């Protein structure tokens, strides 16, 4: 069982603070940190911050760090539970919490401390953190992933004009996840050339990701320059495009404005046909395979009427913030056909797995993801190979807070020999592999 | 002793190839990987890339892998020597390669492993990486340094104009480590805000350092705004300026070039003295209390003639490439008074833990030291504590190849519990 948890506060990619967790058992010590969003849904659980003007600008995360050390920890280790059980240590946090956003502890606590027990319980079990994940989650037959790696930055991740926020790229016809490394690094690298040429080397900084930053506002611009990049690095077969709007960031009145970090001036704002006709286009000009929230969280005609007009993914982040509840009416309205696991979107192990396999049962995909804030924990690549969705989003190659994720998918691929299988062209569903 | 080594590809914070290696022993599993600079002087050991165009565009490290994989594991295994003896497994090492400069296996090569071997050697001695440390440098004092922060980066490869390098806050009269990583991300944080409202939104994206990177040509203007941004943090009593200038970079035909990211034109050169005036003006003008390669790794006279007409640091970098060699040389000229210390100019810990004392012998500081293509990997966290050298640079508080070391330096100062010092104000000089 638990012999001791012990939190504090370190700083994510970003400087900002945030929650890591200590645990101990008579297998050693198991660290867990937790990412943090800057384009957050309505819907997400509590981050809880202690609102310290004199103190990281009301950013510390002291009073989550104490809920742990003062509350939670004497309750697990109370509860004499294994680590292995994750489902019932989960619950009884929860439950402790009592609230439905976990707005007493928090969010960023309680997942702390499940990723932590999650670590430990995969020690007990003596198997890699990937397996015990598959053996909660009841797999048996793991995959390594597609990655999407976000190579041009917008939103509220740069500053540049371009209002989408991610541009990524999907090398889906790499031989293995180690090839599709190779090539995400090599477009990445040519991108940066690319950009270079065209707009100056004051164009390729980065934004929170990782991605370039350039100074255009054209979200067309940012697929052509990613396209180009692709085509001279050689892999136009190989390489497709795919994009998160993350429109309820630039949702105004009903309408959608594409030029948001700009002077506010409400004649420049499109309505949600104009948007889907946009993305029309998108989808008919460049090889883009998969659009994240086209449209604002609580625009369920507009996600509908997208979803039921083209062949492609569409993908569900603040729209269905990884919970079961906005899941199901998800489904049921047919509001998009992929869900984004975010593990902090939800705040705990046990909940997010729920969340994947009830898309999963549906037939949905699954694309576990990363937070723009993130840290040094790889724990979403041990996670997304044991839940086989197939896919992953967790940055550019450019930034450790990424790089540490994807270093980790080699070694896990590695690890697994003649056995790892790559989902490559099946990233939707891998399972048929 | 070790049963197995192997050492694979992994990517920096760049997205380039490095080298990762993996070391077992019956204590577990240790794993290091390998920092590559950008602006690396021409002294520094030989880092090996395959230079296959097609792959990586030429970065690849596939040789310096199998250099470990096929040579050097089953040569120091066969060895039987415990992990606990660094000196002579990274001698074996050395002996191996059998070059100077380490051009047969490469730096990075050597240095993974050597890593590795430290952080297993800790975990047989049972101590933390940060107590072995101190114990193969005979050091019983620790000390938790005052960070360098490079929060506007510029130089070689900066989208901008600026022609020196880094420009660093160092929170001196912090209370603690932990102390000083709020005082360093509170002023990152207003900083963002300073060049965001005079500059614009697109000066505030984000250089290989995590520093920002605004279109500005001058660097007297990189001093104001981090001279603003410290103030309207309500810090001016407690953080003050360093800076990297890289000169190596900007060094033409024997005079400096302050714009040398702009297309060529001699006219604008200036002398090494016309750069120690404008050095002088920066030190009068603004709270700059160290510089690193201010001139030419090889323009050793300027370096000497700086040095002795100047109270602040001065940091030798390119000009010392962590290496005894140089270092004997630049004591004996008085070119400098500080070591940056970089495991990876040299490529091994044994010689790196040498440089450090042949400069602390000689009376300098050392500040230890990232490089601008980092990873996950956190050894210089442990190693500036248990070398106790009072400063180290590790990037901005942005990007977690940086943040994973400042962590981990919050890690070992709440470990040390009450025993923590912090060097604060004596961060030049922290063993008084
Ligand atoms: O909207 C998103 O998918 C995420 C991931 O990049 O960004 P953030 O963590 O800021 O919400
Ligand atoms: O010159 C330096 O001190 C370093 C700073 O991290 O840069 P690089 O590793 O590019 O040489
Ligand atoms: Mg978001
Ligand atoms: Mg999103
Ligand atoms: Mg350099
Ligand atoms: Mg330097």
């Known amino acids: 069982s638990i012999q001791k948890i012990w939190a504090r506060e370190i700083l994510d990619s970003r400087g900002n603070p945030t929650v890591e967790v200590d645990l101990y058992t008579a297998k050693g010590l198991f660290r867990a940190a937790v990412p943090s969003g800057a384009s957050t849904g309505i819907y997400e659980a509590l981050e809880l911050r202690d609102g310290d003007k004199q103190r990281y600008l009301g950013k510390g995360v002291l009073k989550a760090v ?12 109370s509860s ?34 499940s990723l932590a027990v999650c670590k430990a319980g995969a020690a007990e079990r003596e198997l890699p953190l990937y397996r015990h994940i598959a053996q909660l989650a009841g797999n048996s037959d793991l995959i390594l992933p597609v990655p999407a790696f976000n190579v041009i930055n917008g939103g509220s991740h740069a500053g540049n004009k371009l209002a989408m926020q991610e541009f990524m790229i999907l090398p889906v016809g790499a031989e293995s996840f180690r090839d599709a490394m190779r090539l995400g690094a090599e477009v990445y690298h040519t991108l940066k050339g690319v950009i270079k040429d065209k707009y100056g080397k004051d164009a390729t900084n980065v934004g929170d990701e990782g991605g370039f930053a350039p100074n255009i506002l054209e979200n067309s ?28 960031e630039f949702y105004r009145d009903g309408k959608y404005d594409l030029d948001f970090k700009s002077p506010t001036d409400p004649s420049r704002y499109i309505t949600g046909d104009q948007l889907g006709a946009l ?87 699954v694309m576990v993801s990363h937070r723009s804030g993130e840290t040094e924990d790889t724990f979403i690549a041990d996670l997304v190979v044991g839940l086989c969705t197939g896919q992953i989003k967790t940055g550019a190659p450019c930034r450790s807070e990424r790089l540490a994720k994807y270093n980790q998918l080699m070694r896990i691929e590695e690890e697994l020999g003649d056995e790892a299988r790559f989902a490559g062209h099946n990233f939707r569903n891998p399972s048929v592999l």
């Open 66 to 77: 104490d809920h742990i050390n003062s509350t939670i920890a004497p309750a697990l280790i």
């Open 80 to 113: 004499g539970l294994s680590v292995v059980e994750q489902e019932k240590l989960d619950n009884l946090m929860l439950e402790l919490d009592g609230t439905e956003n976990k707005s007493k502890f928090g969010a960023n606590a309680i997942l702390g401390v």
């Open 221 to 248: 611009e940012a697929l052509e320059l990613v396209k180009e990049a692709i085509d001279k690095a050689g892999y136009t077969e190989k390489i497709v495009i795919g994009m998160d709007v993350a429109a309820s």
């Open 279 to 365: 993305y029309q286009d998108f989808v008919r000009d460049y090889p883009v395979v998969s659009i994240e929230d086209p449209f604002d969280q609580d625009d369920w005609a507009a996600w509908s009427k997208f979803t039921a007009n083209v062949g492609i993914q569409i993908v569900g982040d603040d729209l269905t913030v990884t919970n079961p509840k906005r899941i199901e009416r998800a489904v049921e309205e047919k509001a998009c056909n992929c869900l984004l696991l975010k593990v902090n979107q939800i705040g705990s192990v046990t909940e997010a797995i729920q969340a994947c396999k009830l898309a999963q049962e549906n037939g949905w995909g």
